[PDB]
Design a protein around this ligand. Sequence first.
Ligand SMILES: Nc1ncnc2c1ncn2[C@@H]1O[C@H](COP(=O)(O)OP(=O)(O)OP(O)(O)=S)[C@@H](O)[C@H]1O
Ligand SMILES: Nc1ncnc2c1ncn2[C@@H]1O[C@H](COP(=O)(O)OP(=O)(O)OP(O)(O)=S)[C@@H](O)[C@H]1O
Ligand SMILES: Nc1ncnc2c1ncn2[C@@H]1O[C@H](COP(=O)(O)OP(=O)(O)OP(O)(O)=S)[C@@H](O)[C@H]1O
Ligand SMILES: Nc1ncnc2c1ncn2[C@@H]1O[C@H](COP(=O)(O)OP(=O)(O)O)[C@@H](O)[C@H]1O
Ligand SMILES: [Mg+2]
Ligand SMILES: [Mg+2]
Ligand SMILES: [Mg+2]
Lengths: 277, 330, 319, 298, 347, 327
Amino acid sequence: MKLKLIVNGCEAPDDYKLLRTTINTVASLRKTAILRFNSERLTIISTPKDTGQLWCTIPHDVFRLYTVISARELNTITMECNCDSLLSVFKRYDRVMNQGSSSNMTIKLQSPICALGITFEEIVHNKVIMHSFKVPVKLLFRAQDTRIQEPMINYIQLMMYKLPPISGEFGSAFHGFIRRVERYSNVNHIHLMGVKVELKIIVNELDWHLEICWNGPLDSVISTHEVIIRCKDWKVCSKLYAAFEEVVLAISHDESCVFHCSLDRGRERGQIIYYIA
Amino acid sequence: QQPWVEKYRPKNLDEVTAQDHAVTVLKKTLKSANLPHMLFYGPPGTGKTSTILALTKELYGPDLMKSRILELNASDERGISIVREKVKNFARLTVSKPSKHDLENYPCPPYKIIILDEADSMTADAQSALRRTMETYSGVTRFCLICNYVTRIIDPLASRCSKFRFKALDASNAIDRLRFISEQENVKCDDGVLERILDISAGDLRRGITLLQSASKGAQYLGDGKNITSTQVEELAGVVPHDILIEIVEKVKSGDFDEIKKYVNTFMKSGWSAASVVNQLHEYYITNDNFDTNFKNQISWLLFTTDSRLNNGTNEHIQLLNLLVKISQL
Amino acid sequence: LSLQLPWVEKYRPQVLSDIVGNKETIDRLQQIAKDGNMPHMIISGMPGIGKTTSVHCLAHELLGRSYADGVLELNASDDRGIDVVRNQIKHFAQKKLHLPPGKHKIVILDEADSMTAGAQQALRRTMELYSNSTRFAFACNQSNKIIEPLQSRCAILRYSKLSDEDVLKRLLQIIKLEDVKYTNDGLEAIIFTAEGDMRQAINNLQSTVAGHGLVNADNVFKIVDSPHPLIVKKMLLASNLEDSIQILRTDLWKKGYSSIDIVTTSFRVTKNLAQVKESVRLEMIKEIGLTHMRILEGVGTYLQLASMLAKIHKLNNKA
Amino acid sequence: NKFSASTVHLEHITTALSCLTPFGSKDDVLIFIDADGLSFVRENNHVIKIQLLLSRELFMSYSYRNETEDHMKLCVKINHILDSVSVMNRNSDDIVECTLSYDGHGSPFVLIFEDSFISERVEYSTYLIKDFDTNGLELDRERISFEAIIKGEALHSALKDLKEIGCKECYVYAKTEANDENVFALISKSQLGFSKIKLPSNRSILEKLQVFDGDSTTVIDGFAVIGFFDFTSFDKIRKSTKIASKVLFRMDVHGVLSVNILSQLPKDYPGIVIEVCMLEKESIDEAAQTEIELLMET
Amino acid sequence: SLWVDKYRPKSLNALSHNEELTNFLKSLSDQPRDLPHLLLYGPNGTGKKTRCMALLESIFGPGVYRLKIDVRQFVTASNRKLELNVVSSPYHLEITPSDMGNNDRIVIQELLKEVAQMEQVDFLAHRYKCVIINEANSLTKDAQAALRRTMEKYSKNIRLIMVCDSMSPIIAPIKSRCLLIRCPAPSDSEISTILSDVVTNERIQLETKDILKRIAQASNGNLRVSLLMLESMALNNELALKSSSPIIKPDWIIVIHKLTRKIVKERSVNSLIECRAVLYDLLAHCIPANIILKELTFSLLDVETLNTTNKSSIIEYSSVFDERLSLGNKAIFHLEGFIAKVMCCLD
Amino acid sequence: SKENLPWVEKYRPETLDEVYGQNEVITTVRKFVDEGKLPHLLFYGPPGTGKTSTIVALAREIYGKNYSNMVLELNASDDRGIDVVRNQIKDFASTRQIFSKGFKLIILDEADAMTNAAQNALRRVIERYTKNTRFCVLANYAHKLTPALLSRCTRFRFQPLPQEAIERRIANVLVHEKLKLSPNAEKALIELSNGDMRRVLNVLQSCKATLDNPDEDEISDDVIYECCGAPRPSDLKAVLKSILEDDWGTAHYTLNKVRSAKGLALIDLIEGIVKILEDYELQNEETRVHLLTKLADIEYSISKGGNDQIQGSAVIGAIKASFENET
Ligand SMILES: Nc1ncnc2c1ncn2[C@@H]1O[C@H](COP(=O)(O)OP(=O)(O)OP(O)(O)=S)[C@@H](O)[C@H]1O
Ligand SMILES: Nc1ncnc2c1ncn2[C@@H]1O[C@H](COP(=O)(O)OP(=O)(O)OP(O)(O)=S)[C@@H](O)[C@H]1O
Ligand SMILES: Nc1ncnc2c1ncn2[C@@H]1O[C@H](COP(=O)(O)OP(=O)(O)OP(O)(O)=S)[C@@H](O)[C@H]1O
Ligand SMILES: Nc1ncnc2c1ncn2[C@@H]1O[C@H](COP(=O)(O)OP(=O)(O)O)[C@@H](O)[C@H]1O
Ligand SMILES: [Mg+2]
Ligand SMILES: [Mg+2]
Ligand SMILES: [Mg+2]
């Protein structure tokens, strides 16, 4: 049950910013989150159990230290933690490194309800200020842990589209495409479309009908594909794409939608999957 | 494929049978454009929803159907606020322009239709907000109210709507549709059948088609290739056999309370619905010639009271025992 | 068109001497207007007997030329919430307008029965603290709709239904100022159809003189009908069923009265019916309610009213 | 289609549309489309009416292929256009291009926005025209009691102060003196009591104040023009005065007030002519005007 | 474990009560494509739910008995944040909306309108999902009005098999769109045979097999009641059914019998107040008032000291007050009225 | 475009001279208009009597082309709450008249659907602004109106439409549609009308649709009875003769044959037999009581469903057991 990890944001900016990308998303989705500390990999889960589910994979090489032992299989212990407190602590460290510092995070599992001893250091300008925090968490049981499994997605003859990276010429154009529907206050359903490559945001209602289009180039690695989604999930998709260069969009015909995000750390790659029903 | 009730649902106004006083007017409406506000009322399973959904098709066409039709049933919210905003805004909406194909094929009337199915389940406050909506925008939109109990529609709303009563589908005017459906499904029936199915199902073609489907699904399960007889139809309909109802009658004739109570306790264990045994007793007592005028005059009111009490959702055992004990004291 | 006001507003009394009826109360109001010391009062009664024109005239006479900045009339058409009581009424009470000795500011809270509870509970403190300068004149139709602590500090003035002579005097004054031709039976019919309501007497007289000119029984009864409670009472107090069904049909069904209106009026008439045994009255109430339920459920037919009358006669003859 | 209009100055259209938001933001807006341009006529409770004027020179393109009819009237919900045109036209390298079109009756009003790589399209289904005459809420051209021209900033400050002090009711003064002195104040009845905001007589604020004898020709001095207006309707011009340089005020003897917002992008187009007609209250009270006069005396 | 849920048949061939009802369910399951909406009605404890499960097993194959329980949240107009457990499984869904209360409309308009608009297109046969509505007779006449069109329009992707007893308070439109399947209660011979199967399987030592017949006649055609009685008697007698084993009965039944004895013996106002106290005690235990009235009537009719006139008056008052309770709000008034009328008629 | 309208709305009286039936009300409001003083009006009557047409025609005559800016028509389709009463009606009444030199009109249709809170706030609005605005209240149920609002408004009763007015409107409709109506069919239409012109128009339109050639054929009584699905006047007396003169075996057969020849409904036969028996000279005073109290219960049970044959036999039993008293 002994859990201890060390994070250094300045040492590795990518894996650290993906950790910022995972925490902000689980804060924006809903309160509380599920953290399974597998001996080789971390996975941050927000299961509402219609509402979407996020499954972000975090490897073990991202942190300087990943000592994890438990009596369960593969040293797996699963936490339930209120996301507001850890988000506040994480923002505090963001301000700590913004003011100028290179200190690391010492996170230890100090004691079923437990807490994490997230302690770090900050220097103002050659002064020593110790920041100590304790976020109360609960220990998920193994029988409760196996009740949570990642949603499955198939494409017998469906269609995944390669979203252009945000660092390219068309990245800002596609970001504006995704955020264009977010400007309207009175929108609750968006109807995505798939033609094989064009994708359109259609919002048809009793007296008004949006039909936004993307006329730029698109890629689909290797038939109609339409789905009805909520606007908040589209906002989460916007936020996920804004922080990812490699974004994968797959659309199922009246079944589901999946927002796949991947960071090429090469090394195991960190991936974020947003299952949407 | 699909249940026979949905497979053989009328698609055009030429398959709605036995309602020749309300279909001819709607078909004359096809040529003109003066469709009035309609109030469809009648017994359940008479074809009102199968008539409006066919008239809408003939009037508009599949492509114009999604744009010129708004359907609101009891399965969605129809409160005073909903009537005041959604229905009013749809009525205020301008008539959509038909396409060239729609104009060249379908009549395309210059109005839209708001169908309010199961309007008897609407509160009298929400019904009062339609009174001026169906009159101010009567030239841009049309209204069709469908219900089974016309008394639950307020008089101001019933005044503005043309009333079309859908007749009960008995074995005389709905026999042709059942015989067409049976022949289309290769159902081999005896003589007398298809006239007993339409009699057990009193004024309801939906039940008369479901019972025929149920009788065929067993006939094709046995595999002997025999004709469906008039006893199986009652066996899957719930009609009490004429040997148990006879025991009921001959136990009523002997006015001993305890034996009647014991036989009713045994009878209720067989699962028979009281609404069917009361009906069969009504037929037996009214049609019999061994009972005088006073006995029938009292039995009519007794059976009427029992049926009215059973319609309110009461215990079948208590009401049936009370009815039979009262009959035994006549 | 024309600027000619309706006679209800054209002949609204502007002095306390022109308000007929309740002589013992109007005289006391005049005594208050002369002396000056006006206590907090609650004027209640039936509609149209002169409860508003009395308070307004009393305030006018009591304040003279200071009426514009000495009164604060808050009706139900204004937002008489708790915020208004806490701000506008408080600031009007805190005003230090100088008045002749004995005179006081008047807050005419007309239609105070529709005021909310928190507003009245704040009004409690408003009249508790600022009582030496401003006075509150509540005008209502039902005194029980004002909370008991507010009624404790006030003086209750119960206006009554106007008789057949005060209304006749006011009608004769109007007919003298409008040169209206009349006959005694027509004026008596107007009084009978008014039911102690001066407003509904003036309106009927104006309608009759506009439609026909001469005020006789025929010209009156051909434009304004006899009161339907008095026809429902005649229907419910008959002897035979064939004589009550006639008054039901030919006087309430072919005339245009809804069945629910007939039942609602029948309940009120039964509640006030006299010379009827209490068992008979409660049975009649039960039979009227059983038909009211059926009419409210949808079956508002003449057959149901006939059945209700038949059951009333059944309970009358033996039960 | 039968009508098409495109532009890039989305800020101007957004400012014009935001002047119709004070009148609810949850109802219907009626649009005129003729050769001169396109307008938004909005009325509330038949007591106040606001009318925009977007000239054809404002847009780069204005075709109006409707040869059959002189003008086209359509009725749509106002909130949706307010939300749509609020693109703020960011990323100045790629200017968001507007496209307004309307094919005719039965066709929806189209708002196509082009972001070079993005071409979104919004369709607004029109509603049936309510049987109301916009000519009712109009002022005389022969019965003007007074005509005043006031700069936008001072008037906007006056309305802001009136809103801040509550101002449940408002009054208007217009008196001209024979010694070229012109007085113009917005007297208000609020929680505070009796408050007066006197506009300065200098030509930088009061360019021209002329009081007539109900004939719009005579110049009578020493007379006063009194207009009792509900501040609920008078506050609707506050947002319109935030974009105006000069405001024209005209009232007649029949109790209607015409606030003419003069707003001063293409060179040919004059601007947004915003006209806010307003009805005067009946003012059954008679001593209130006497008190207004006495307050203006001292 | 409970012997009711440990010997429940899990197939159409393991259901031994009515050979005629199994041969009809097999005919229904032969061609599952055209399965109509079904309404199973019969006496309680017959096994209508078990036969529905067997039909679902014959249609969708095995795997209909692995039930996953999820709680769905529904919000009313007043934002009361109501609650309802939704027992579900592969290929079928089970709901008892009547438990939600008078707000069953808010669940039959959400669950039955969201699973009927899913089309169940998996990876191409859309098929249909069978929804079982337990206690279909407890709906408030507004859940059925919003259900008739729901199951009529979306019949392609959903099928409804409603389970109920005494289908009187079910409206005519619902019964018109549903195929009515009667489930008669087993005779004492079949119940005795089933109890014999249980006792040889459980290895309990019975003597005088007549005891199983006694349990069958005491259960009144209720397999659940008979099995619970058998288990209680075996456990209280240490797995040895002696010939004088006491046939245990529900406590509320004995209390209702004592109430009937008090009514027969004492007929006064104070006895009526004691009867009210007993009725309030029974009502505090969530026992339906209709069932209480039925038991009271059929226990007062079993008294051997009452003549035919008294029994006829009792049954007439029972019918009248049952109809009154069906159209009322507070049942204590109707129960007291029935008891007072019985007391007045007896003396 | 007026020919694509339903006959109910196509033949709406545009002027006050096209409103038939109500004469003492029209001839009073016309004198009110000509004199120049229009008091606060209340229009009461059964549905389809012509209240909403009379008030609109009166306002059109008063204002002419200024109808739009001087009439505030509010009905049950609008949220006529206390907030609306204080925020729209009050400022429509407060503002000065728009060029007409007279008064404004506020028409509150279906005022019986207004709440008591919104009706107790309109009283002082009516009283205060009487000089420059007037109020017309239209309702069919006067028990939902507050007594003070009923006292502030002059009451005009719209009687059910007489036979002569219905026949004179029928003549105009026949002239405009080039239709022909048999003398025996006009009486049937008037009898089924129950004083409602909307029923006249809605039945006549379906009668025209029923005719194969609407330019040569005539609308007989058979056409009307088939279109509206009502029992013939002979089928209502044959059933009663069988019930009151035959046995219990042939009366049932006659009833079920009458109800199956043309598919007639039980409730229509009940309401026809009631009207036929109301003219009877029953000399027991208990036969009438039994008939009413039993046929009303059967009518109430019919409205909630149930077995049709059981209720049909109950009608025969209730009519037979009642006349046993008379004999
Ligand atoms: N005249 C008819 N001709 C042919 N089929 C009919 C007719 N009347 C009813 N049906 C059949 O009855 C079934 C149900 O018809 P619907 O019109 O949907 O029911 P309904 O008349 O609306 O009764 P409700 O919904 O309880 S009010 C369908 O299978 C129809 O085909
Ligand atoms: N006693 C009276 N003397 C003279 N006119 C009267 C009298 N009572 C009522 N009126 C007339 O009634 C109209 C004014 O009614 P009000 O006095 O305002 O009614 P009210 O008695 O206050 O009833 P409510 O509460 O307002 S419904 C005018 O036409 C008056 O002339
Ligand atoms: N006296 C009449 N003369 C001619 N047509 C009439 C007459 N009365 C009613 N109608 C017709 O009936 C239609 C409906 O009547 P309306 O006046 O609009 O409603 P209403 O009579 O006021 O009934 P309510 O109370 O509003 S449901 C009118 O449009 C006319 O076509
Ligand atoms: N054919 C059968 N053989 C053995 N037991 C049965 C059979 N049918 C029903 N049962 C018993 O009935 C019990 C369930 O009854 P239930 O389905 O609740 O009846 P109902 O549906 O009438 O309420 C089960 O425990 C089962 O043991
Ligand atoms: Mg239907
Ligand atoms: Mg008053
Ligand atoms: Mg009307």
